[PDB]
Amino acid sequence: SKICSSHYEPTVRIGGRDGLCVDVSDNAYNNGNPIILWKCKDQLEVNQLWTLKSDKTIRSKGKCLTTYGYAPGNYVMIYDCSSAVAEATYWDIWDNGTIINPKSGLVLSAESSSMGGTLTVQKNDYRMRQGWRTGNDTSPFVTSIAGFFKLCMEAHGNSMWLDVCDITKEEQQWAVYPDGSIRPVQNTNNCLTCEEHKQGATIVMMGCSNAWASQRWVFKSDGTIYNLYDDMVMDVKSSDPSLKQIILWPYTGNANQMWATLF
Amino acid sequence: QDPIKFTTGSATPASYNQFIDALRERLTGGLIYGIPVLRDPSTVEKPNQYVTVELSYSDTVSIQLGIDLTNAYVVAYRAGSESFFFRNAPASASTYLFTGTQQYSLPFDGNYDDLEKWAHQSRQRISLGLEALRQGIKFLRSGASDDEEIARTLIVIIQMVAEAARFRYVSKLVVISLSNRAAFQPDPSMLSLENTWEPLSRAVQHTVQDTFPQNVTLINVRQERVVVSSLSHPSVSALALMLFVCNPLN
Ligand SMILES: *[C@@H]1O[C@H](CO)[C@@H](O)[C@H](O)[C@H]1NC(C)=O
Ligand SMILES: *[C@H]1O[C@H](CO)[C@@H](O)[C@H](O)[C@H]1NC(C)=O
């Protein structure tokens, strides 16, 4: 009832693109060994566990998550926290799912769509491939997504629209990946994405292998599904369910913009 | 101006939501990480620790609930010139609530273990919906001195008003119910949220580097363990109102 204590330094996994985990290459801890994205293993291994140190370092087995440099494309590696340049070891994990390096202003990124890829720092574009979620439990969050009036988001091939909520329908089960993508349980290769980065674009299905800023979303405290890059939210076209169309639109706060994760 | 009220006789997905938002707005002490938070207990004087809410069945039948502004808990209800406080209620509740009515004590506390115990039925088996709510108000407004039934009806009301205000998930479930014109029982995820309100509140407020200091475990429809550790985890959006724990800064 006074002030929260922040001396707690938790150790957790960091999931991202396609539900993979931030892994320390072949459990090799030699200064410079690159950091990559690997299958989150069944066991909670040290090379995939990180400690959110109070000085803003993210350590694994005593070494520091570090960027080779401050330029777009520079990869990130494991490195002795004392031997390294201090600025290259600091990271801010924002509430948006962005891991940013203060000194460079660049953000943790997974540019390769293939497991094993090395992580790098890049200009921040709030793309699916730059979205992360701390936590040992790195699995996608499966759940229903309820819009207004007894209506739930349903997958229809490569299209998505509303239908009366029915827990028996698999087409209404969604998988929200640690990278911010909302995927249809029946085909995790599909991802809800806007067609265009403009007001009015409809949300459709597209191959997640792209990992665009249009395939990343945050379930905001105001009940909306929000897109960082576009600064807009999922909205039921002119509050008319029959139009079988969910589009991008600026925040109004109306019922047709309210959603709820019904897991 | 006037106390928050819910006219069930003309309830709609819209009127119900308007009702809940007004209650949340009234209970909001501030905001932490964009999430509304109940007022800090060591900040409110006892004369301002309670608020009333009215639930009407018709233009001549309604009851009022007494709610502690500090924890969003229902501490009592009023029916006619009588009022009933949970056995668990502190001296201040009857001192500032229901003044003017004959006040009485209930033989059970306002927690779910006791309520379930006296209702001979757990939450998971008690139906929720518009027809249950209205049945309950009419039952409480009368005087049928049946504790088993009073506890059961109070379990209905607490979740449709109190939990509904705390969770965007609950109010959402109540709305599909109205739209569906079909009763429903809480699934294991609804109970998970009810049973985890306090630690979730503690988690959020202790957040550092977008991470909770200690994980918070939630249970879903399939009864699977969903272990949350991030302030930006989608499940956190189910929280509409937090219990106050600490102000972040240091
Ligand atoms: C994650 O797992 C590690 C190793 O099992 C454990 O030490 C750590 O505390 C866990 N993170 C939590 C529970 O916050
Ligand atoms: C998230 O990152 C910071 C702090 O959380 C904030 O300035 C930024 O605006 C956020 N991202 C958005 C909303 O684009």
Author numbering:
A (entry chain B): 5 to 267
B (entry chain A): 1 to 250
Paper text:
Ribosome inactivating proteins (RIPs) are enzymes that can inactivate ribosomes. The molecular mechanism of inhibitory effect on protein synthesis has been shown that RIPs act as a RNA N-glycosidase hydrolyzing the C-N glycosidic bond of the adenosine residue at position 4324 in rat 28S rRNA. Some are type II RIPs consisting of two types of polypeptide subunits, A chain of homologous and functionally similar to type I RIPs and B chain with a galactose-specific lectin domain that binds to cell surfaces, such as ricin abrin and abrus agglutinin (AAG). Abrins are potent toxic heterodimeric glycoproteins with an LD50 of 20 μg/kg body weight; while AAG is a relatively less toxic heterotetrameric glycoprotein of which the LD50 is 5 mg/kg body weight.
We have successfully solved the structure of 120 kDa heterotetramer agglutinin AB and CD chains, and reduced the R-factor to 20.4% at 2.6 Å resolution data. The AAG AB-chains are very similar to the abrin-a molecule, the structure of which has been described in detail. A conserved disulfide bond between Cys246 of A (or C)-chain and Cys8 of B (or D)-chain holds the two chains tightly as shown in figure 1. Two NAGs are found in B-chain, but only one presents in D chain. An AAG molecule is a hetero-tetramer contains two subunits, ABA'B' (or CDC'D'), stabilized by mainly hydrophilic and little hydrophobic forces. 22 hydrogen bonds between A (or C)-chain and symmetry-related A' (or C') were found. The active site is exactly the cleft formed by the intersection of all 3 domains in AAG A (or C)-chain. Five invariant residues (Tyr73, Tyr112, Glu163, Arg166 and Trp197) and five conserved residues (Asn71, Arg123, Gln159, Glu194 and Asn195) are located in the active site cleft. Docking study revealed that due to Pro199, agglutinin is unable to form a critical hydrogen bond with G4323 of 28SRNA, which is found in the docking result of abrin-a. This may explain the lower toxicity of agglutinin than abrin-a, despite of similarity in secondary structure and the activity cleft of two RIPs.
